[PDB]
Prior knowledge:
2 helices, Endoribonuclease Dicer homolog 1, monomeric, three-stranded antiparallel β-sheet, RNA binding, elongated, miRNA, alpha+beta, hydrolase
Amino acid sequence: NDICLRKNWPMPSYRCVKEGGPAHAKRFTFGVRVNTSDRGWTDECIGEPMPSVKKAKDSAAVLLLELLNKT
């Protein structure tokens, strides 16, 4: 969140795109997007299917940091 804050943007969107399923689908996949003032909502950064919802957000966010590293 530091990079988005520092860039003087609002707080990014965070919501699991896939969570739960037919038992064997408790891997969570989530996509992030940020409001890059120069363009707007960034490309939705889908993370990897993670076995914990906290890891879901953070790991996608890590890919987002790469996007925000190109600003």
